[PDB]
Amino acid sequence: PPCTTEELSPPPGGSLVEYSGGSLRVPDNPVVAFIRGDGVGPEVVESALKVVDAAVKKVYGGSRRIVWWELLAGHLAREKCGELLPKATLEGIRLARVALKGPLETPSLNVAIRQALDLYANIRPVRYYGQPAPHKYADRVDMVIFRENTEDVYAGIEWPHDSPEAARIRRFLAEEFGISIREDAGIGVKPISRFATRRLMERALEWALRNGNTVVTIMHKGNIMKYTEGAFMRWAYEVALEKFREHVVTEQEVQEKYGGVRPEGKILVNDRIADNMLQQIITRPWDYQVIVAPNLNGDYISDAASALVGGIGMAAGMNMGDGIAVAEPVHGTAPKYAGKDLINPSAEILSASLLIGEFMGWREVKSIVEYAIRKAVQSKKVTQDLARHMPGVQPLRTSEYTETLIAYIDEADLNEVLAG
Amino acid sequence: SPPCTTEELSPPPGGSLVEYSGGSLRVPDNPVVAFIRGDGVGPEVVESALKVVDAAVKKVYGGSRRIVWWELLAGHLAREKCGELLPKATLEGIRLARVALKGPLETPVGTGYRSLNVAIRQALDLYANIRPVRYYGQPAPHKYADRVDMVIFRENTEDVYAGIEWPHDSPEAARIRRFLAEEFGISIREDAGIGVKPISRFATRRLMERALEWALRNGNTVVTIMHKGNIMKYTEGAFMRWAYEVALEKFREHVVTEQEVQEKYGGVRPEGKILVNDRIADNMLQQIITRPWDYQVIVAPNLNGDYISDAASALVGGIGMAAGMNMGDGIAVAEPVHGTAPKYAGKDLINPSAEILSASLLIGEFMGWREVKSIVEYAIRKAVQSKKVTQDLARHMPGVQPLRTSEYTETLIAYIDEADLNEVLAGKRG
């Protein structure tokens, strides 16, 4: 496994995924980079490769074969190459276009990867797998959050209240704009751009078109923050109408042209005030599918949705750029379950299924992997984090849950798994 | 009768003004309370609230206490009588009374989101937005709705809601971008809108003090600071640190820190002390959904407060029933979270519960008349349980004939009048 950009050597038995003109090109023997990561990461990434690879083989009958390619990040990289994040990893992902990733410790390194590959879109699916859940309507949560991951107040533009830099900003704002900010105030800046908004909405719409989603909802506080969040909403509606006119419909258009009903074959593009959006996913979760949001709103809504379905530890994610994606769990390294064989690998498995099934196009892999996880929960064969919430259920270990899952995958009839 | 000018201001006969002097609110037995009917459904729900509250106070204090209601004008009735939407006299009247119940107001012409409400808050320096969220037995999407009993103390003057921002294409945004680049090497795209987020020591401290005072008053056991301080170190992080700071500075004997509890104390929460803790904001959303029973008083900056209180109300099926108050130092104005509901205005259809509960917040919590809150909540619960409700609730209860607003008012009055005080006021008196 490579330690310098010249060492860069992908496995022979696999062709590269291509980018070069709008369309991503995926062959039958595709190279997918995998990173082990830190803590529970090696535990759960190895768990996923075993699961996905019993599928891909069980799903396509053998014509397809995923070729796993190792890249080093975290403790494993520091043990070999002598650094936490090597350049050869970034260039490895850059040539492969697709990669799967465990959590990394930050003594964050996640942000470096994102910033170096321009992974501007954070993608978080939230779905119900039958677990014990606090939401009466957990089973009607079937959502994907498209979260802008480069701007907003999360860009780190801020200064301590007692810093000379904050003092210079305060006086600058006062003198030039008659803005008054207290002397004992910390100061942050919130940038939202047309370019970043447009890219994110384009990816969200292309995703909706791919999966036959019928609603895309922009989540914003544009009534109060007119020029950042309101601009976000306006720019999102604008690209939608500009580049997706024929695939797209507006709430007003529905209530003017189509007798109050969204036409089949067409996506409803709407918007919700951010605090209202939180209320609506709780009250009317069936009304929402794809949610498009700036950084913070996206962070909050995805977290809230995962809590509703009792999937906090099970949340899977993915960071996507133009021709490139890196899938990873929401959770951290969990240093208290690592090397313990106790942790839930569900998040890491679903992440693999997100990348391979929902972004490469291999829809049949997602279908089965999710069938198994649902079957695991139905017959109460899961790890301690779930088993602690079910009366009198014995926890199944991590390595046990994997083999349990492979079993459900191969044992399954594909006429009941792949329909419509 | 209701005043248009400063000279016309005259609190009603028989009433004594609430006082605030040397940090203490003195509430007489016959206190003047201002009320503003407001707009749309405002008059209807305010009228309901006055009647329900009046019944409650009569019932519980045996005629020895009585609210002396003082009508002030804002919105459409002020426009009609005074020729303007918000007379100075109205503001001055609230400042004299110290306590006021108000309906929602329409936001005028092209003045900015809820601008009359903003004008009132700023003129009177009502910095703290207080929203109780409780469950009254409604149909609700949260399996644990009945474990939701919270109050959100929301800082209501700063944060990104303070309106400091410039359009992407503006000359000002251009000048800010280059200042930031040349002075600090900060890169912002040319096609970016720019907002500014201030959070100060002074505003945070004020808010936290009022939250702790509320916790002491209500025997709350936990106060939780909601913040995104791991990412926004110098605004939200500072908010959290300054909040912890005043807690230990001014309430030491009364409070224990979580970073203290498991370490020094028993491990499990000690007896008597208020646990002051903190939760990362997105986790806080998860926590109220997964373990609502672990949370009581939530303390938050403007945006976090806005989001969490909305989420909590959705959990309990209380969206159209949510109450609030905005509070300053000697002073408070209570009002429903909801708007004017123009389609329902004048139809005797609207749910007055939110306004009633705002009055209950004002009178039972802010003014101290605990028993009034107890009996009002009892009555609303009984109505819900009995399925004697307005259409917003009844529409979710198959086969139930909804009550008109005025009928629902009389139902609550009847429950209050019929109430068995030994049960309803058990442990709740004095």
Is residue B111 within 8 angstroms of chain A, CB to CB?
no
Separation CA A55–CA A356 (nearest Å): 11
Q: How far apart are CA B283 and CA A317, in angstroms?
A: 17
By Cβ distance, the residue of A179, A184, A312 closest to B286 is: A312
User: Cα B34 from chain centroid?
Assistant: 17
Write down the experimental method used for this entry. Answer: X-ray
Confirm if B315 and B371 have CB atoms less than 8 A apart: no
Map out the domains of chain A as residue ranges. Answer: 1-420
- Substitution target in A128, A226, A233, A286 with the highest count of B β-carbons within 10 Å is A226
Short-list B111, B89, B40, B135, CA closest to B353: B135
d(C-alpha B239, C-alpha A12), whole Å: 55
| Exposure b/e, A349-383, CB count within 10 A at least 16 = b | bbbbbbbbbbbbebebbbbbbbbbbebbbeeebbb
Q: Which two tokens stand for residue A129?
A: 């797998």
- Nearest C-alpha of chain A: how many angstroms from B27? 34
- The answer to the question of whether B121 is labelled as a binding residue is yes
Taking Cα atoms as reference points, which of A51, A218, A88, A235 lies closest to residue A145? A218
Quick one: which H or E segment has residue A275? helix A274-283
Report the amino acid identity of residue A39.
Answer: G
Nearest CA in chain A to B236: A186
> Is B192's CB within 8 Å of A151's CB?
yes
What separation, in Å, do the N-terminal and C-terminal C-alpha atoms of chain B show?
Answer: 36
Q: Give me the residues of A, 317-346, that contact B with CB < 8 A.
A: none
Judge whether B161 counts as a catalytic residue: yes
CB contact under 8 A, A187 and B175: no
Please, which residues bridge with residue A273 across strands? A220
Strand-pair category, A267-273 with A248-250: parallel
Give how far the C-alpha of residue A42 lies from the chain's centroid of Cα atoms, to the nearest Å: 20
**Per-residue exposure over A188-206, b if at least 16 CB sit within 10 Å of its own CB, e if not:** bbbbbbbebbbbbbbbbbe
Distance CA B172, CA A173 (A): 10
A258 catalytic per annotation: no
List A190, A221, A375, A381, catalytic entry: A221
Cβ–Cβ under 8 Å, residues A194 and B168: yes
CA B26 to chain centre: 21
The answer to whether the beta carbons of residues B387 and B351 sit under 8 Å apart is no
**Residue A282 with chain B: CB contacts under 8 Å:** 141-142, 311, 314-315
Helix ranges (DSSP H) in A69-225: 75-80, 87-96, 109-117, 164-177, 194-210
Radius of gyration of chain B (CA): 22
Tell me the pairing of strands A267-273 and A215-220.
parallel
Closest Cα to residue B382, out of B78, B168, B136?
A: B136
Residue A24 forms beta bridges with which residues? A19
Residue in B283, B290, B270, B160 with CA at minimum distance from that of residue B227: B283
Chain A, residues 205-224, CB within 8 A of chain B, namely 221, 223-224
Q: Are A330 and A153 in contact (CB under 8 A)?
A: no
Gaps in chain A (C to N over 2.5 angstroms) fall after 107
B228 as an active site residue: the answer is yes
Partnered with residue B200 across adjacent β-strands are A185
Q: Is A275 a catalytic residue?
A: yes
Contact A228 B165 (CB under 8 A): yes
Strand-pair partners of A326: A99, A319
Question: What sections of A118-177 are H helices per DSSP?
Answer: 164-177
- Alpha carbons B379 and A207: distance in angstroms, whole number: 50
Distance CA B316, CA B327 (A): 24
A60 at B interface, C-beta within 8 A = no
- What is the Cα–Cα distance from A210 to A123, expressed in whole angstroms? 15
Q: Does A164 touch chain B (CB under 8 A)?
A: no
Q: Report the CATH architecture of B1-430.
A: 3-Layer(aba) Sandwich (3.40)
The residues near B254 (Cβ < 8 Å, ≥ 6 apart) are B212, B216, B273, B274
Tell if the CB–CB gap between A279 and B193 is shorter than 8 Å. Answer: no
Pick the CATH number of A1-420 from 3.40.718.10, 1.20.120.80, 3.40.50.300, 3.30.930.10: 3.40.718.10
From chain B, pick out residues whose CB is under 8 angstroms from the CB of A137.
Answer: 141
H or E stretch at A67:
strand A67-71
The closest of B317, B387, B388 to B143, measured between CA atoms, is B317
The structure tokens listed for B412 are 């609550």
Tokens of B358: 């705002």
Contact between A221 and B158 using a beta-carbon 8 Å cutoff: no
Q: Are the CB atoms for B117 and B109 separated by under 8 Å?
A: no
Resolution for the entry shown, Å? 2.2
According to DSSP, the β-strands at A142-148 and A290-293 are parallel
Tell whether A193 lies on the interface with B, counting CB pairs under 8 A. yes
